[PDB]
A paper describes a structure:
In siphophage T5, the unique RBP is located at the extremity of a central fiber. FhuA, an outer membrane E. coli iron-ferrichrome transporter, is the bacterial receptor recognized by T5 (25). We present the structures of T5 tail tip, determined by cryo–electron microscopy before and after interaction with its E. coli receptor, FhuA, reconstituted into nanodisc. These structures bring out the important conformational changes undergone by T5 tail tip upon infection, which include bending of T5 central fiber on the side of the tail tip, tail anchoring to the membrane, tail tube opening, and formation of a transmembrane channel.
Author numbering:
A (entry chain i): 626 to 688
B (entry chain h): 345 to 464, 626 to 688
C (entry chain j): 345 to 464
Write the structure that this text describes.
Amino acid sequence: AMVLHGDMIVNGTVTASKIVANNAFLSQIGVNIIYDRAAALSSNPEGSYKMKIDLQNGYIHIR
Amino acid sequence: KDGSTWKQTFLIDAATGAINIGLLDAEGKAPISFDPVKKIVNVDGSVITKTINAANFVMTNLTGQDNPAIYTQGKTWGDTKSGIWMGMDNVTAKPKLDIGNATQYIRYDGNILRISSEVVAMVLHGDMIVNGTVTASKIVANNAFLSQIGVNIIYDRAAALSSNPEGSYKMKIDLQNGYIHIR
Amino acid sequence: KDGSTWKQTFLIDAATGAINIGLLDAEGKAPISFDPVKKIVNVDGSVITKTINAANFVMTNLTGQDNPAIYTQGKTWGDTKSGIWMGMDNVTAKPKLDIGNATQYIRYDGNILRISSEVV
């Protein structure tokens, strides 16, 4: 329900439950456990990937 | 009396109970003339109106084809003009409405609405547990306290916000073909 | 008749076609008095109204400075009050509108709108 005719400097909080886009010129990030859309958009986001860099427990799994 | 024109204004006739006031323009009627026979209360216009007591909202004398409505005469739901229309339309049995032009406006029908316009179009005064689907085409933010992720081929905003998201980066971890390129 | 005040209500004069009803408050007029000479249909107020047939929407007798509009008397587009205003404003030639206060409301002008509010 957001039809856009201008540029938004949001003075509130931009929350959400899902996100699809083509790119993102962001400022600072957060990604707990590196899946990929090689698996995410693909079925089972824990599906076909080659290396999942989880920064929580010294986890560099290389495939 | 006037010239050869016996202009008559007030009348009461003991033949049909007709009660007439004001000059005549109709074939046998005047703006505020009356006819208790086949009773009808006919009036029009009010220079001063500072009050009502009931709504004066519905339209009747035709249950279906006098649609209850307060609207701009000469414009309705589907006109390119920037006029207005409100009330309970009865050709659809439920309210029609349109405020503004045909591109930057608010349209409504008794069942659904069409507001093809923005606002500064998500202004937020509360916290959202979205019960729908939050889709999008682009995203810019300062951080994200997410739950689960997806990132096909690890670029960086060292390249993404920078020109050519395939631009200046140092290691692109694509999880699709055993691709760890280190620079 | 009353006291030394000959309060007159109904009248018809064969000098100017004047048709008068009700007590007088104006200089030479009454709420539902009439004057077919320089014709005018003047009335006001209706205790019972359960019907209309045409909109009763436009405002005329001044093409530009009687703006076609149904609105709260004493408030319009740009007032901090929480009143309302609707219709085809003619000082801008197109509809003005505002429902609610000056912070949590919906504003509109014939061309554009300003709804500085949320929804869930």
